Amino acid sequence: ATKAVCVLKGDGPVQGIINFEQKESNGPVKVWGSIKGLTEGLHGFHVHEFGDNTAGCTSAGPHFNPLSRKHGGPKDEERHVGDLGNVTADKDGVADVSIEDSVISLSGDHCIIGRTLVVHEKADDLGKGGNEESTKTGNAGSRLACGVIGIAQ
Amino acid sequence: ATKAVCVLKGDGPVQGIINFEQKESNGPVKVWGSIKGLTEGLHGFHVHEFGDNTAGCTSAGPHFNPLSRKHGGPKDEERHVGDLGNVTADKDGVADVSIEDSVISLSGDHCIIGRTLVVHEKADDLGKGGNEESTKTGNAGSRLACGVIGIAQ
Ligand SMILES: [Cu+2]
Ligand SMILES: [Cu+2]
Ligand code: NA
Ligand code: NA
Ligand SMILES: [Zn+2]
Ligand SMILES: [Zn+2]
């Protein structure tokens, strides 16, 4: 399989390690790991365009969107490539992440390697919020932690 | 063109921002930026195989070496793809990095996106140190700071 990894860090207590695996060319990508330091409940979770952390997570730019689509949820046909929905933190502030996605890839034009994974302050409304930002950012708010997605062994 | 960036961090603080630019896929990569917190003199400087910072810079693995060649300096034919030689810190501990390299790339199979840039404790002996480690690591010693190479705007 092709593999990737990301260490999430930010200005506050949110930190984690997320793994990626793609067993087959153009096959599903498994995304799994843990993030701690979160408020209980849903937090938006996306791949952003740039693997630039020079001024922290803001430097990563907008969601990764090579097809020029509107923001959506991962189950939607209308979504950005980087739209991975929400992760859910428990009462202790820990999110056990376990996602399978076939829109992201670890090779080719939808490759996420060298881009930034971000976990947000608020839940992502998946493009269903009824204001104009919903179909751009999902109203997920501030960026709590992020890291560049790297090739793994 | 075509751009990448890397934020180097380690204890000291040893820290820096390194930029990469490649005008065309058949052209060289310019590598430039600044690193502070270093001891005066030469420090080894390489791209390592994995963009994995899970346990700090050790997790990046060996030098990026897809052709399975011996370690060398950047001018040599027999070198690892990731072998960028040394950077030089002044009396204030600052290295102004300015490299052009024709063996690394920002696309294709020598692509360094998603890999780790590392600056070392010791100078790299460029494979001419006369012990067996010389033609593996250049005897550059510990890893002072590193970061994953990300796609830049
Ligand atoms: Cu996001
Ligand atoms: Cu090195
Ligand atoms: Na969802
Ligand atoms: Na040299
Ligand atoms: Zn989006
Ligand atoms: Zn080497």
PDB file of C-alpha atoms in Angstrom, chain A:
ATOM      1  CA  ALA A   1       0.000   0.000   0.000  1.00  0.00           C
ATOM      2  CA  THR A   2       0.930   3.678  -0.373  1.00  0.00           C
ATOM      3  CA  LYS A   3       0.978   5.400   3.074  1.00  0.00           C
ATOM      4  CA  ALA A   4       1.033   8.903   4.495  1.00  0.00           C
ATOM      5  CA  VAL A   5       1.014  10.486   7.970  1.00  0.00           C
ATOM      6  CA  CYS A   6       0.277  13.833   9.558  1.00  0.00           C
ATOM      7  CA  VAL A   7       1.150  15.266  12.954  1.00  0.00           C
ATOM      8  CA  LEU A   8      -1.519  17.823  14.012  1.00  0.00           C
ATOM      9  CA  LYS A   9      -0.371  20.711  16.225  1.00  0.00           C
ATOM     10  CA  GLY A  10      -1.571  24.290  16.883  1.00  0.00           C
ATOM     11  CA  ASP A  11      -1.486  27.206  19.314  1.00  0.00           C
ATOM     12  CA  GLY A  12      -3.586  25.486  21.974  1.00  0.00           C
ATOM     13  CA  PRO A  13      -4.061  22.005  23.367  1.00  0.00           C
ATOM     14  CA  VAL A  14      -5.250  20.192  20.202  1.00  0.00           C
ATOM     15  CA  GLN A  15      -2.826  17.570  18.951  1.00  0.00           C
ATOM     16  CA  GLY A  16      -2.906  14.284  17.152  1.00  0.00           C
ATOM     17  CA  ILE A  17      -1.518  11.783  14.653  1.00  0.00           C
ATOM     18  CA  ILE A  18      -3.477  10.795  11.555  1.00  0.00           C
ATOM     19  CA  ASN A  19      -2.481   7.940   9.202  1.00  0.00           C
ATOM     20  CA  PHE A  20      -3.489   7.373   5.579  1.00  0.00           C
ATOM     21  CA  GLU A  21      -3.302   4.170   3.573  1.00  0.00           C
ATOM     22  CA  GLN A  22      -4.235   3.465  -0.066  1.00  0.00           C
ATOM     23  CA  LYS A  23      -3.859  -0.227  -0.853  1.00  0.00           C
ATOM     24  CA  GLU A  24      -4.640   0.054  -4.573  1.00  0.00           C
ATOM     25  CA  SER A  25      -4.237   2.612  -7.311  1.00  0.00           C
ATOM     26  CA  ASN A  26      -7.242   4.920  -7.323  1.00  0.00           C
ATOM     27  CA  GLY A  27      -8.664   2.756  -4.507  1.00  0.00           C
ATOM     28  CA  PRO A  28     -10.118   3.930  -1.205  1.00  0.00           C
ATOM     29  CA  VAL A  29      -7.955   5.811   1.233  1.00  0.00           C
ATOM     30  CA  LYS A  30      -8.279   4.775   4.876  1.00  0.00           C
ATOM     31  CA  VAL A  31      -7.764   7.673   7.259  1.00  0.00           C
ATOM     32  CA  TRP A  32      -7.351   6.840  10.966  1.00  0.00           C
ATOM     33  CA  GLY A  33      -5.777   8.029  14.179  1.00  0.00           C
ATOM     34  CA  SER A  34      -6.587  10.076  17.268  1.00  0.00           C
ATOM     35  CA  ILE A  35      -6.817  13.754  18.150  1.00  0.00           C
ATOM     36  CA  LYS A  36      -6.901  15.050  21.723  1.00  0.00           C
ATOM     37  CA  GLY A  37      -7.613  18.387  23.398  1.00  0.00           C
ATOM     38  CA  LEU A  38     -10.904  18.997  21.578  1.00  0.00           C
ATOM     39  CA  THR A  39     -14.255  20.150  22.949  1.00  0.00           C
ATOM     40  CA  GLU A  40     -16.851  17.326  23.026  1.00  0.00           C
ATOM     41  CA  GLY A  41     -18.755  16.961  19.725  1.00  0.00           C
ATOM     42  CA  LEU A  42     -18.166  17.416  16.027  1.00  0.00           C
ATOM     43  CA  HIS A  43     -15.230  19.323  14.516  1.00  0.00           C
ATOM     44  CA  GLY A  44     -14.697  20.070  10.846  1.00  0.00           C
ATOM     45  CA  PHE A  45     -11.835  18.130   9.202  1.00  0.00           C
ATOM     46  CA  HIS A  46     -10.404  18.953   5.794  1.00  0.00           C
ATOM     47  CA  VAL A  47      -7.365  18.913   3.543  1.00  0.00           C
ATOM     48  CA  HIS A  48      -6.401  22.500   2.639  1.00  0.00           C
ATOM     49  CA  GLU A  49      -4.544  23.466  -0.501  1.00  0.00           C
ATOM     50  CA  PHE A  50      -1.046  24.430   0.693  1.00  0.00           C
ATOM     51  CA  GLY A  51       1.422  22.560   2.877  1.00  0.00           C
ATOM     52  CA  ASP A  52       2.516  25.927   4.253  1.00  0.00           C
ATOM     53  CA  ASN A  53       2.613  26.323   8.069  1.00  0.00           C
ATOM     54  CA  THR A  54       4.828  29.412   8.081  1.00  0.00           C
ATOM     55  CA  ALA A  55       2.301  31.475  10.081  1.00  0.00           C
ATOM     56  CA  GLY A  56       0.491  28.499  11.545  1.00  0.00           C
ATOM     57  CA  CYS A  57      -2.636  26.977  10.099  1.00  0.00           C
ATOM     58  CA  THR A  58      -3.866  30.127   8.322  1.00  0.00           C
ATOM     59  CA  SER A  59      -1.024  29.752   5.829  1.00  0.00           C
ATOM     60  CA  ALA A  60      -2.594  26.552   4.430  1.00  0.00           C
ATOM     61  CA  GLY A  61      -5.131  28.580   2.463  1.00  0.00           C
ATOM     62  CA  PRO A  62      -8.565  27.391   1.410  1.00  0.00           C
ATOM     63  CA  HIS A  63      -9.902  23.812   1.146  1.00  0.00           C
ATOM     64  CA  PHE A  64      -8.180  21.702  -1.497  1.00  0.00           C
ATOM     65  CA  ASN A  65     -10.502  22.146  -4.470  1.00  0.00           C
ATOM     66  CA  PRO A  66      -8.796  21.280  -7.794  1.00  0.00           C
ATOM     67  CA  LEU A  67     -12.196  20.688  -9.512  1.00  0.00           C
ATOM     68  CA  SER A  68     -13.689  24.132  -8.586  1.00  0.00           C
ATOM     69  CA  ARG A  69     -16.725  22.691  -6.796  1.00  0.00           C
ATOM     70  CA  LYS A  70     -18.788  23.966  -3.873  1.00  0.00           C
ATOM     71  CA  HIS A  71     -18.112  22.793  -0.325  1.00  0.00           C
ATOM     72  CA  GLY A  72     -19.999  19.705   0.812  1.00  0.00           C
ATOM     73  CA  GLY A  73     -19.837  16.695   3.028  1.00  0.00           C
ATOM     74  CA  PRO A  74     -17.755  13.623   2.208  1.00  0.00           C
ATOM     75  CA  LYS A  75     -20.834  11.652   1.126  1.00  0.00           C
ATOM     76  CA  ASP A  76     -21.924  14.332  -1.350  1.00  0.00           C
ATOM     77  CA  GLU A  77     -21.170  14.405  -5.031  1.00  0.00           C
ATOM     78  CA  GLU A  78     -20.831  18.183  -4.796  1.00  0.00           C
ATOM     79  CA  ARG A  79     -17.776  18.664  -2.533  1.00  0.00           C
ATOM     80  CA  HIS A  80     -14.197  19.846  -2.529  1.00  0.00           C
ATOM     81  CA  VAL A  81     -11.586  17.055  -2.847  1.00  0.00           C
ATOM     82  CA  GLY A  82     -10.408  18.015   0.672  1.00  0.00           C
ATOM     83  CA  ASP A  83     -13.885  17.754   2.318  1.00  0.00           C
ATOM     84  CA  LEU A  84     -13.633  14.996   4.978  1.00  0.00           C
ATOM     85  CA  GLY A  85     -16.629  16.160   7.060  1.00  0.00           C
ATOM     86  CA  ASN A  86     -16.419  16.061  10.831  1.00  0.00           C
ATOM     87  CA  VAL A  87     -14.592  14.082  13.503  1.00  0.00           C
ATOM     88  CA  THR A  88     -16.293  13.511  16.868  1.00  0.00           C
ATOM     89  CA  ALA A  89     -14.602  14.115  20.208  1.00  0.00           C
ATOM     90  CA  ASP A  90     -15.817  12.365  23.324  1.00  0.00           C
ATOM     91  CA  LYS A  91     -16.239  13.838  26.760  1.00  0.00           C
ATOM     92  CA  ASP A  92     -12.483  13.528  27.454  1.00  0.00           C
ATOM     93  CA  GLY A  93     -11.769  15.589  24.353  1.00  0.00           C
ATOM     94  CA  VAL A  94     -10.512  12.660  22.239  1.00  0.00           C
ATOM     95  CA  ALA A  95     -11.642  11.936  18.654  1.00  0.00           C
ATOM     96  CA  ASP A  96     -10.960   8.471  17.285  1.00  0.00           C
ATOM     97  CA  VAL A  97     -10.801   9.088  13.564  1.00  0.00           C
ATOM     98  CA  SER A  98     -11.800   6.344  11.175  1.00  0.00           C
ATOM     99  CA  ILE A  99     -12.749   7.433   7.641  1.00  0.00           C
ATOM    100  CA  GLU A 100     -12.667   5.766   4.223  1.00  0.00           C
ATOM    101  CA  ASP A 101     -12.693   8.152   1.262  1.00  0.00           C
ATOM    102  CA  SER A 102     -12.245   7.601  -2.469  1.00  0.00           C
ATOM    103  CA  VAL A 103     -12.157  11.229  -3.650  1.00  0.00           C
ATOM    104  CA  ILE A 104      -8.834  11.991  -1.957  1.00  0.00           C
ATOM    105  CA  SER A 105      -5.843  10.055  -3.224  1.00  0.00           C
ATOM    106  CA  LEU A 106      -2.195   9.480  -2.291  1.00  0.00           C
ATOM    107  CA  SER A 107      -1.130   9.848  -5.996  1.00  0.00           C
ATOM    108  CA  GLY A 108      -2.129  11.845  -9.101  1.00  0.00           C
ATOM    109  CA  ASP A 109      -4.106  15.059  -9.390  1.00  0.00           C
ATOM    110  CA  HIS A 110      -6.155  14.446  -6.247  1.00  0.00           C
ATOM    111  CA  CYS A 111      -3.027  13.717  -4.259  1.00  0.00           C
ATOM    112  CA  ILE A 112      -3.061  15.166  -0.751  1.00  0.00           C
ATOM    113  CA  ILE A 113       0.588  14.548   0.005  1.00  0.00           C
ATOM    114  CA  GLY A 114       2.333  17.841   0.735  1.00  0.00           C
ATOM    115  CA  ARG A 115      -0.981  19.528   1.601  1.00  0.00           C
ATOM    116  CA  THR A 116      -2.267  20.419   5.088  1.00  0.00           C
ATOM    117  CA  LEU A 117      -4.814  18.526   7.210  1.00  0.00           C
ATOM    118  CA  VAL A 118      -6.794  20.874   9.525  1.00  0.00           C
ATOM    119  CA  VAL A 119      -9.185  20.228  12.444  1.00  0.00           C
ATOM    120  CA  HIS A 120     -11.530  23.123  13.303  1.00  0.00           C
ATOM    121  CA  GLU A 121     -13.190  24.861  16.227  1.00  0.00           C
ATOM    122  CA  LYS A 122     -16.778  24.255  15.080  1.00  0.00           C
ATOM    123  CA  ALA A 123     -18.666  21.509  13.273  1.00  0.00           C
ATOM    124  CA  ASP A 124     -18.760  21.623   9.471  1.00  0.00           C
ATOM    125  CA  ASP A 125     -22.349  22.202   8.278  1.00  0.00           C
ATOM    126  CA  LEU A 126     -21.560  20.252   5.066  1.00  0.00           C
ATOM    127  CA  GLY A 127     -22.843  23.026   2.797  1.00  0.00           C
ATOM    128  CA  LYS A 128     -26.326  22.887   4.276  1.00  0.00           C
ATOM    129  CA  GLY A 129     -26.228  26.010   6.468  1.00  0.00           C
ATOM    130  CA  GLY A 130     -28.108  28.483   4.326  1.00  0.00           C
ATOM    131  CA  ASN A 131     -25.503  31.371   4.348  1.00  0.00           C
ATOM    132  CA  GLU A 132     -22.931  31.913   1.590  1.00  0.00           C
ATOM    133  CA  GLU A 133     -19.987  30.674   3.649  1.00  0.00           C
ATOM    134  CA  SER A 134     -21.658  27.303   4.120  1.00  0.00           C
ATOM    135  CA  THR A 135     -20.820  26.285   0.510  1.00  0.00           C
ATOM    136  CA  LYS A 136     -17.166  27.622   0.972  1.00  0.00           C
ATOM    137  CA  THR A 137     -15.957  26.635   4.453  1.00  0.00           C
ATOM    138  CA  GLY A 138     -18.973  24.860   6.024  1.00  0.00           C
ATOM    139  CA  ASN A 139     -18.811  27.531   8.814  1.00  0.00           C
ATOM    140  CA  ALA A 140     -16.244  25.384  10.634  1.00  0.00           C
ATOM    141  CA  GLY A 141     -14.545  28.420  12.129  1.00  0.00           C
ATOM    142  CA  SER A 142     -11.014  28.669  13.428  1.00  0.00           C
ATOM    143  CA  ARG A 143      -8.235  26.231  12.784  1.00  0.00           C
ATOM    144  CA  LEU A 144      -7.227  24.519  16.032  1.00  0.00           C
ATOM    145  CA  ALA A 145      -4.437  22.258  14.732  1.00  0.00           C
ATOM    146  CA  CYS A 146      -2.893  21.259  11.459  1.00  0.00           C
ATOM    147  CA  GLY A 147       0.107  19.588   9.841  1.00  0.00           C
ATOM    148  CA  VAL A 148       1.587  18.807   6.495  1.00  0.00           C
ATOM    149  CA  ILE A 149       0.707  15.388   5.069  1.00  0.00           C
ATOM    150  CA  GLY A 150       3.928  13.416   4.531  1.00  0.00           C
ATOM    151  CA  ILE A 151       4.951  10.215   2.804  1.00  0.00           C
ATOM    152  CA  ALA A 152       5.121   7.359   5.311  1.00  0.00           C
ATOM    153  CA  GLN A 153       7.015   4.107   5.310  1.00  0.00           C
TER     154      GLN A 153
END
